[PDB]
Amino acid sequence: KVFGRCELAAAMKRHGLDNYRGYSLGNWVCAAKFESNFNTQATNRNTDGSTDYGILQINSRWWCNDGRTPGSRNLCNIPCSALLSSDITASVNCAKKIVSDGNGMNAWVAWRNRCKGTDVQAWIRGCRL
Numbered sequence: 321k322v323f324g325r326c327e328l329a330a331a332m333k334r335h336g337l338d339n340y341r342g343y344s345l346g347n348w349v350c351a352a353k354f355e356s357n358f359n360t361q362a363t364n365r366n367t368d369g370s371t372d373y374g375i376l377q378i379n380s381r382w383w384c385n386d387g388r389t390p391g392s393r394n395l396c397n398i399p400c401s402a403l404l405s406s407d408i409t410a411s412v413n414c415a416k417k418i419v420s421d422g423n424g425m426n427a428w429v430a431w432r433n434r435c436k437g438t439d440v441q442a443w444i445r446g447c448r449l
């Protein structure tokens with residue numbers, strides 16, 4: 321599914337991301353935009369052989385099982401394919417674990433490089449929430 325901006329903001333709010341661990345909604349929308357272009361089916365192989373999955377590009381080295389990342393863990397205890405659904409529940413639930421792991425949203429390199437320090441509220445302007 322390719323979400324619209326506001327459509328995603330609303331879905332993320334319904335799933336509890338707004339101000340989760342202190343991160344306002346626009347942080348999550350901005351991160352999704354630059355991670356996946358708002359596409360739940362995005363997959364991208366990393367240099368270490370892991371793959372990133374879904375709207376928040378969650379990585380198989382640590383977070384999910386894809387059966388092809390030797391020596392990895394599955395800390396969200398989910399198949400990586402769950403993270404590609406049109407329903408964002410699994411991605412949101414795993415993102416909550418990731419952002420609680422000690423480095424906050426810095427776990428998403430794109431957030432750190434593209435959203436942190438910027439006016440992220442822009443990403444939810446205009447939306448019915």
Ligand SMILES: Nc1cccc(O)c1
Nearest residue numbers: 389390391392393394
């Ligand atoms: N050593 C190790 C670490 C994680 C996963 C596995 O299958 C092996």
Ligand SMILES: Nc1cccc(O)c1
Nearest residue numbers: 435436437438439440
């Ligand atoms: N100093 C500064 C300004 C905006 C956001 C942030 O994370 C830090």
Ligand SMILES: [Cl-]
Nearest residue numbers: 324325353358
């Ligand atoms: Cl957009």
Ligand SMILES: [Cl-]
Nearest residue numbers: 387388389390
């Ligand atoms: Cl694996």
Ligand SMILES: [Cl-]
Nearest residue numbers: 331406407408
């Ligand atoms: Cl959804």
Ligand SMILES: [Cl-]
Nearest residue numbers: 341423424425
């Ligand atoms: Cl934090």
Ligand SMILES: [Cl-]
Nearest residue numbers: 344345346441
């Ligand atoms: Cl915001």
Ligand code: NA
Nearest residue numbers: 342343344440
């Ligand atoms: Na804020």
Ligand code: NA
Nearest residue numbers: 380384392393
């Ligand atoms: Na894994």
